[PDB]
Structures are given as C-alpha cells and as structure tokens.
Amino acid sequence: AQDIFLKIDGINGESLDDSHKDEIEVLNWNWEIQQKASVKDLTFEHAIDRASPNLMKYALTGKHVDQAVLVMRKAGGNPLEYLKLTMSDVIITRVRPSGSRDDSRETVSLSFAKVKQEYVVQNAQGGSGGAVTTSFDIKGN
Amino acid sequence: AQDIFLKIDGINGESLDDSHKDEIEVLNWNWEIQQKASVKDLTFEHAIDRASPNLMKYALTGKHVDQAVLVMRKAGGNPLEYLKLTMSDVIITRVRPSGSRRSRETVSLSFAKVKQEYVVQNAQGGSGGAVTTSFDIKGN
Amino acid sequence: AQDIFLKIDGINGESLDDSHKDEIEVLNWNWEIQQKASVKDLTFEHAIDRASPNLMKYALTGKHVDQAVLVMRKAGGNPLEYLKLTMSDVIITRVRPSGSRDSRETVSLSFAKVKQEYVVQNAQGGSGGAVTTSFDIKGNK
Amino acid sequence: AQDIFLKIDGINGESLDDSHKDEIEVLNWNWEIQQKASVKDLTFEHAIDRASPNLMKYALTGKHVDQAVLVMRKAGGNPLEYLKLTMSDVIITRVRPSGSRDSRETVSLSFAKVKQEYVVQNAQGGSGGAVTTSFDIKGNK
Amino acid sequence: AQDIFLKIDGINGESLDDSHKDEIEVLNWNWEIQQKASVKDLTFEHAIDRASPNLMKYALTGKHVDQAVLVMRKAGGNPLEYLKLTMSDVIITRVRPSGSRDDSRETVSLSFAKVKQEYVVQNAQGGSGGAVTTSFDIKGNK
Amino acid sequence: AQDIFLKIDGINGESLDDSHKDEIEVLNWNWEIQQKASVKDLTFEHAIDRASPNLMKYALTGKHVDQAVLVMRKAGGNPLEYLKLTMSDVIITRVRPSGSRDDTERSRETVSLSFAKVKQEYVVQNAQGGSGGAVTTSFDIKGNK
Numbered sequence: 003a004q005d006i007f008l009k010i011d012g013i014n015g016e017s018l019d020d021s022h023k024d025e026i027e028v029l030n031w032n033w034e035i036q037q038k039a040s041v042k043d044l045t046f047e048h049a050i051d052r053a054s055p056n057l058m059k060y061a062l063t064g065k066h067v068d069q070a071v072l073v074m075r076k077a078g079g080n081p082l083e084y085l086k087l088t089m090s091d092v093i094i095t096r097v098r099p100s101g102s103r104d105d106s107r108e109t110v111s112l113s114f115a116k117v118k119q120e121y122v123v124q125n126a127q128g129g130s131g132g133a134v135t136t137s138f139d140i141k142g143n
Numbered sequence: 144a145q146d147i148f149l150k151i152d153g154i155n156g157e158s159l160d161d162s163h164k165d166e167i168e169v170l171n172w173n174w175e176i177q178q179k180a181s182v183k184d185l186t187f188e189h190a191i192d193r194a195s196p197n198l199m200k201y202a203l204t205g206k207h208v209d210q211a212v213l214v215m216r217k218a219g220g221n222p223l224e225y226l227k228l229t230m231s232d233v234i235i236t237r238v239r240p241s242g243s244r245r246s247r248e249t250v251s252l253s254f255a256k257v258k259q260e261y262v263v264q265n266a267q268g269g270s271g272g273a274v275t276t277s278f279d280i281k282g283n
Numbered sequence: 284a285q286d287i288f289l290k291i292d293g294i295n296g297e298s299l300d301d302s303h304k305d306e307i308e309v310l311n312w313n314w315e316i317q318q319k320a321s322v323k324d325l326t327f328e329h330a331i332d333r334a335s336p337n338l339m340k341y342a343l344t345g346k347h348v349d350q351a352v353l354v355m356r357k358a359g360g361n362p363l364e365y366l367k368l369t370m371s372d373v374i375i376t377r378v379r380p381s382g383s384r385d386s387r388e389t390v391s392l393s394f395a396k397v398k399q400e401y402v403v404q405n406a407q408g409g410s411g412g413a414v415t416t417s418f419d420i421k422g423n424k
Numbered sequence: 425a426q427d428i429f430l431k432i433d434g435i436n437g438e439s440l441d442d443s444h445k446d447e448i449e450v451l452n453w454n455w456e457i458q459q460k461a462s463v464k465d466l467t468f469e470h471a472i473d474r475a476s477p478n479l480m481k482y483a484l485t486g487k488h489v490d491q492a493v494l495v496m497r498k499a500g501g502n503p504l505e506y507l508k509l510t511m512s513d514v515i516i517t518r519v520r521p522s523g524s525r526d527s528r529e530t531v532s533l534s535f536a537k538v539k540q541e542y543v544v545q546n547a548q549g550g551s552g553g554a555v556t557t558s559f560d561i562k563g564n565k
Numbered sequence: 566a567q568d569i570f571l572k573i574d575g576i577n578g579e580s581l582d583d584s585h586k587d588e589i590e591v592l593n594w595n596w597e598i599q600q601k602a603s604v605k606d607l608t609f610e611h612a613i614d615r616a617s618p619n620l621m622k623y624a625l626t627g628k629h630v631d632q633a634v635l636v637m638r639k640a641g642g643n644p645l646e647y648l649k650l651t652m653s654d655v656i657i658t659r660v661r662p663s664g665s666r667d668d669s670r671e672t673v674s675l676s677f678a679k680v681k682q683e684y685v686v687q688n689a690q691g692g693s694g695g696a697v698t699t700s701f702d703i704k705g706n707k
Numbered sequence: 708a709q710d711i712f713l714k715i716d717g718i719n720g721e722s723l724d725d726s727h728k729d730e731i732e733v734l735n736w737n738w739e740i741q742q743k744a745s746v747k748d749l750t751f752e753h754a755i756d757r758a759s760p761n762l763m764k765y766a767l768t769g770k771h772v773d774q775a776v777l778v779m780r781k782a783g784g785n786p787l788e789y790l791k792l793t794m795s796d797v798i799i800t801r802v803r804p805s806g807s808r809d810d811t812e813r814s815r816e817t818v819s820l821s822f823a824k825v826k827q828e829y830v831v832q833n834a835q836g837g838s839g840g841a842v843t844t845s846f847d848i849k850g851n852k
Contacts, residue, residue: 004812016263030807035766037800037821050226052274055259059276061176074806074814085755085806085814095178101215102171103147106226113178119760123721134757136764157403191366193414196399200416202316236318242355242366243311244284253318297544331507333555336540340557342457376459382496382507383452384428393459438686472648474697477682481699483598517600523637523648524593526566534600579831613790618827618844624740625846656742663737664779664790667708676742 009071013056043111050106060094080128089114115141152209184251201235221268230254255281292349324391341375361408370394395421433490438474465532482516502549511535536562574631606674623657643691652677678704716773721757748819755814765799785836794822823849
C-alpha cells in the first residue's frame with residue numbers, strides 16, 4: 003500500500019508524515035487529457051480533514067492558489083517518490099463532501115494553467131534510476 | 144460506527160441522544176459544489192420518523208426554516224463532534240419516502256448561507272484545532 | 284418482516300389479515316416530491332393478485348377512485364400502524380406486470396390530495412405521539 | 425418453479441405438456457402500461473425453438489395474427505392456471521435471437537385488444553374467485 | 566457446451582472440426598429485428614484468429630461477400646445442427662479487437678440483404694425431427 | 708498469461724524483456740472500426756512508467772510520431788508474436804493517469820492513439836506450437852486506400 007500526498011499552497015492537511023507533514027493525504031486520484039486539446043480537472047479523493055473548510059471556501063470564492071503538487075511514494079523499504087505532478091495557478095472547481103454512520107470522504111477537483119510531471123524509474127535495488135520530466139503551459143498553449 | 148445528527152428549526156426528530164435530543168438521526172448524507180459557482184442541494188438519508196410528515200409539508204409549501212445544522216460525532220470513548228455544517232435560510236427541496244416488507248427517506252436541503260467547522264482530533268482523542276469558513280451564497 | 288397494506292376503493296386485494304382483509308399486500312413502495320413543487324406518482328410493488336385485472340382496466344380507462352390509503356405496520360408483539368399515507372382523487376397511471384418460470388407487479392398512483400400520519404413508538408412498543416400533515420396538491424393548498 | 429405458456433395462432437412451439445402441446449414455453453415475460461394511455465409491447469423470453477423461424481418472418485412481414493394467449497400455471501399438486509392474458513390482433517414487433525458456446529430469444533408483441541383473467545387460489549390449493557377485465561386499445565374502449 | 570460456427574465466403578478461420586474446417590468458431594452471437602421494419606446488424610464474438618486481418622480489410626473497404634452462414638450444433642452424442650442462419654450479400658460493418666495480458670477476443674458485426682433461418686427439432690432419441698424454414702428479402706422488401 | 712508490448716518512436720517504456728527492451732508493456736488494449744468508415748482511436752492501458760511524462764507532452768502538443776507497433780506474444784515455451792498491429796503517423800489523443808493507496812501500487816494510465824495507416828499481421832499456431840501461416844492486411848485510412 004503506497005502513500006499519496008498533495009501539497010496545496012495556503013490549504014494544509016493533517017498528514018503526520020515527517021517528509022510531507024501538514025499535507026493532504028490522497029486516497030485516490032485521476033486525471034484526463036483529450037483532443038487544441040482539452041485538459042480535464044484533476045480529481046482526487048481524501049477523507050474530510052483540516053483542509054475541508056478551506057477547500058469549500060476556495061471553491062465558492064474561486065480564488066487562485068499559487069501551486070499544487072501531487073506526489074506518489076512507493077511503500078516498503080524503498081520510499082521513492084516515483085511520480086510528482088506539479089500544477090501552477092490552481093483553481094478549486096469542485097468539492098463533494100459525504101458521510102455515513104456505518105464507517106467520511108471528500109472528492110475535490112483542481113483546475114490549473116500549468117502542469118509539470120516528473121517520473122523516476124526504480125531499479126532492482128529499489129533506488130532511483132532515470133528521471134523523466136515534461137512541462138507544458140496549458141493557458142499559454 | 145459514528146453518529147450523525149441534523150437539527151432543523153421547527154422540524155423535530157426522535158433521537159434519544161442526551162446532547163442531541165429531538166434531532167434527526169442521519170444514516171448518510173452528501174453535498175456538492177461545482178463551478179460564479181453552483182451550490183447543489185444537500186442530500187441526507189434518514190429513517191421515516193416524526194420529522195417526515197413536516198418535511199413533506201414544508202417541501203410542498205416551500206416555506207423557509209431559519210437554520211439547519213448537520214453534525215458528525217465519532218464513536219468509542221472519544222465522542223468528538225468533528226464536523227458541524229451550519230446552513231441558514233434552509234428550504235426543503237426534495238423528499239423521497241420509501242418502504243419495504245425498516246424504511247428510509249431521502250431529503251434534500253437548499254440554503255442561502257453555509258458555515259463549516261472541522262475539529263482535528265489529537266492522539267488522546269480530544270479536540271485539537273478548529274478550522275471554520277463561512278460564505279453567503281445568496282449575496283455572493 | 285413488517286406488513287404493508289394498501290386500500291383502494293373499488294379495487295380489492297386478497298389479504299387474509301384480520302384487520303386488513305381484502306386489501307393489497309404491498310411488498311415495497313416509494314414516493315418522491317421535487318421542486319410550485321412537482322409531486323411524483325406513488326409507486327408500489329405487489330404480487331399479481333385479485334386486484335391486478337382491475338388495476339389494468341382503471342389504468343387504461345383512467346377513471347378516478349375516491350381514496351387510496353397506504354399503511355405500514357410493525358412486526359412482533361407490537362403491531363403498531365406507524366405510517367398511514369392517505370391519498371384522495373387517485374388515478375392509476377402505470378401498471379407493470381411481470382412473471383418468471385424460475386410473480387410481481389409494479390403500479391404507480393397519482394392523486395390530488397395527500398395526508399401523512401406518523402406514530403412514534405415508545406420503549407414498551409406502544410403508541411407515543413402522532414404527527415399529521417395534509418396538503419391539497421391540485422388546489423395548491 | 426411454475427410453467428408459463430404462450431399460444432399464438434399460426435405460430436406453434438414444441439411444448440410437450442399435454443394441456444399446452446405445441447405452444448411456446450415462456451421462460452419469463454413482462455408488460456407495461458403508462459399514461460389516453462400508452463400501451464407498451466408485451467415482451468416474453470423463450471429458448472430458440474420451432475416458433476423462431478416463423479416469429480422472424482412475421483416480424484419482418486408485419487402480418488397480423490388472430491390471437492395470442494399467455495397462461496401461467498402453478499407448480500406442485502395444484503396445477504391451476506391462475507393468469508390468462510388474451511391478446512387480439514397481435515403483431516410481432518421485435519425478435520432478438522442469441523446464442524453462446526457455454527440459447528434464448530426475446531420477442532415483443534403488439535395487440536389491439538387485451539383481456540386478463542386472474543384466478544384466486546384458496547389455502548387448500550383449489551380455484552376460488554375469477555376476476556376478468558377487457559379493453560379495446562385500438563378502439564379506445 | 567455446444568459448438569457454434571460461421572462460414573464467410575473468402576474469409577476463412579482456423580476451426581479444426583472436420584465438418585466445419587477453416588470456419589470461424591463463434592463464442593457468442595446476437596441479432597435483433599425491430600419495427601417497414603428495421604433489421605439490426607448480426608453481431609458475433611470470436612477469438613482473434615486467421616480471419617481477423619481479413620475482417621479488418623472488409624470493414625475498411627466495405628466490400629461485399631457472397632454469403633455468410635451461421636450454424637449452431639448440439640453437444641454430446643447427438644451432433645445435430647439445430648439452427649442455420651444464412652445471410653446473402655453480407656457487409657462487414659464493425660470490428661472490435663481487444664486483448665489483455667491476463668487471459669483475446671474480437672467482436673464483429675455483419676450487415677446482409679437477405680436472411681434465411683432453418684431450425685430442426687430434436688426428438689427424444691437425439692435425432693432430427695421437423696425442419697422449419699423461413700426466408701425474407703430485406704433489401705427487396707419481400 | 709501472455710505478454711503485450713507497444714513500441715512507439717521517441718516514447719520509450721521500461722520493459723526488461725530482451726526482445727522488447729525499453730518498450731511499453733501493455734496490460735490491456737482495445738480498438739474499434741465502424742461504418743466511408745469510421746476508425747476509432749486505439750486505446751491501451753499501461754502502468755505509469757517512463758513513457759508517461761512524454762505521453763502527456765505529446766497529447767498536449769499534438770506532435771506526430773513516425774510509427775507505433777503493438778505486439779501480442781504467446782506465453783509458455785513458444786514465444787510466438789501471433790499478432791502485430793503497425794500504425795503509421797500516430798497521434799496521442801488521450802491520456803488518463805490514475806492512482807490509489809488501496810490497490811498494490813495502483814498506477815495505471817489509459818492512452819488512446821490516432822493513426823493514418825494501419826497494418827495487421829496474424830500468425831497461426833499449429834499443433835506442436837510452432838508458427839503456421841501469416842495473414843497480413845494494410846490500409847491507408849487518411850488516403851482512403
């Protein structure tokens with residue numbers, strides 16, 4: 003079971019991880035690009051936490067945040083952050099809180115003007131291999 | 144298994160909880176906001192109870208109620224009300240009773256103002272930090 | 284398992300219950316109201332019985348019946364009728380018979396006046412407080 | 425497990441039942457009426473059998489058949505035909521054959537007249553009261 | 566488990582059955598007719614085989630083939646071809662190949678101008694009983 | 708369990724297979740043709756790997772790549788490449804990354820390809836498991852030929 007973190011400027015979570023403290027722990031996420039081209043909002047799901055009141059306020063006001071960084075880290079004895087997705091000029095577009103009394107999550111969508119993706123290859127020893135990075139200015143084409 | 148309560152002005156439930164007596168016990172609920180922005184009605188599910196006849200009449204008449212407060216509280220030995228969703232100028236918009244040979248009912252709420260309060264729980268199960276945000280939807 | 288009954292004027296069932304004889308035994312039912320406001324038809328599901336031929340004929344002809352009363356009663360040693368849904372000026376709008384070799388029927392009801400009665404049950408299983416509301420759907424009252 | 429039969433004039437099946445020989449053995453069926461009112465085609469499912477080639481031809485040609493009678497009979501030691509749905513001026517409107525290596529066919533019927541007969545079975549298992557209704561769908565009567 | 570075969574002129578499969586060699590082994594199939602009337606394309610599913618490259622070219626080119634015959638045969642000790650669906654002036658209208666690492670199938674749809682169905686009833690001994698045959702000219706409305 | 712590979716010019720994967728080194732290992736794929744005719748994009752699903760950053764860039768820029776070849780190879784003792792789908796003038800049209808903490812290292816990406824020329828080669832496998840007959844078909848989708 004891997005760990006996924008999301009660092010949004012001005013909106014802190016309650017992650018107790020040493021390397022990603024006060025960040026949002028993301029249970030799952032998805033993104034889509036379709037054909038210039040159409041970039042869909044990045045949707046992630048997290049439990050209702052410290053960031054939930056601020057996420058609703060930003061969604062209603064529509065205020066921009068400087069940057070949002072999504073990180074996925076391998077589990078086990080090789081904690082490699084193999085994927086890092088950096089989003090610049092992020093807008094909160096959708097928040098869906100929910101809850102039940104039988105064992106609460108929240109679905110949030112992010113829209114951004116710039117995106118950078120970094121991937122790290124893991125070798126047999128579990129360390130870092132080669133890093134591939136691509137960037138694009140969605141707003142500026 | 145946590146406990147969820149909803150306190151609507153003028154519409155009492157039949158909760159036997161000491162601190163939330165005569166409130167609606169909510170089995171599950173959901174809410175959504177989409178992009179100024181569109182605020183969807185808050186939907187909650189509760190068993191058919193004392194509040195059901197008044198919920199139908201308010202839905203049909205469309206009369207406004209002053210406030211509706213949604214509260215979630217943890218279970219176990221640390222009963223912390225970690226989420227409080229306060230809604231002002233609430234309208235009953237949808238009621239969906241159902242039954243089978245237990246019976247539940249789905250109700251939707253529309254409001255002009257919303258306030259959310261979240262309480263962080265520490266390692267001892269007590270209260271940590273409270274984060275509150277407010278927004279007036281009607282007046283933008 | 285609880286017992287659900289539906290009394291329709293001129294359309295008798297085959298229930299053998301002493302207090303609810305010749306009524307329609309309802310396996311399940313649902314109703315919906317949406318926003319003046321749009322009142323949806325009340326849908327109930329029952330096995331094909333004596334009322335089925337008359338329900339089809341009324342649906343085709345569209346003739347109004349005087350009153351339809353929906354009652355739910357708890358099981359066990361406390362047979363309390365905790366929900367009574369009285370509908371006036373009832374029209375049969377949908378009939379869906381079905382059958383399988385390895386049978387039930389779905390019927391929808393439209394009405395101009397609705398009244399709901401709920402009874403709270405105490406710790407002894409007896410009657411507590413009764414809450415009743417009424418509305419004239421066609422007359423907008 | 426009850427037995428369901430369908431007798432279509434000019435389109436014989438391969439049922440080996442003595443009372444319903446050469447009829448179509450219906451695995452399952454459904455019908456719907458909605459709000460003058462809209463009468464949906466009666467859909468029944470049966471295995472691919474002797475009637476399948478004729479059902480396809482009638483669907484393509486659109487020729488009318490005089491009558492189609494749907495019958496359901498209870499199982500056990502009390503073989504009561506408790507439901508008889510008689511359709512006049514029947515048109516074959518839909519045929520869906522299918523098959524797999526690890527076969528069934530779905531057919532829909534359109535008719536101008538409908539007659540439903542229901543027989544109440546008493547606790548012992550004998551015939552009780554019969555309720556019959558009829559309607560002229562094409563003639564609106 | 567029965568056996569289903571499809572014989573398309575000019576598009577051979579890799580069936581090893583002696584009676585139906587070089588035909589397409591159909592895993593499953595379906596057809597629909599709706600109300601003069603609308604005849605939907607016959608859709609069958611088969612594993613990716615020798616016929617797949619030729620099925621793609623006919624879907625892309627749209628060329629007509631003379632005949633396609635769909636046959637279902639019972640299993641056990643009574644191998645009776647109880648259903649035979651003959652289609653004339655057949656057009657390949659849809660090809661949907663797919664595959665997965667964890668076990669590949671392909672879905673193909675056929676459009677035809679004439680249709681002929683033959684059904685054979687099976688008696689208690691498992692042999693042939695009565696044969697019922699109907700034909701219709703879809704394009705000619707006959 | 709068979710092995711599926713996809714070789715895209717300029718977009719390398721991290722396949723450790725000797726015959727298909729630095730290619731994209733495809734978990735599953737699908738393609739569709741409908742009726743001149745409409746050729747849908749070829750959609751394949753793969754784990755988030757070295758090719759993922761470049762697939763996103765080509766999707767956003769819309770730059771054309773020379774060729775993309777999809778290969779399905781039988782497992783067992785006979786590694787026969789029984790299906791080969793060659794696509795010319797390929798365009799990256801869809802990228803759908805996703806992830807979760809629940810499934811074991813859940814990192815799957817769904818990618819769709821648009822191409823102007825298509826070529827399919829199928830190889831029959833005989834009773835012993837060796838190669839049989841090869842069937843090949845080509846078509847110029849953009850040129851209608």
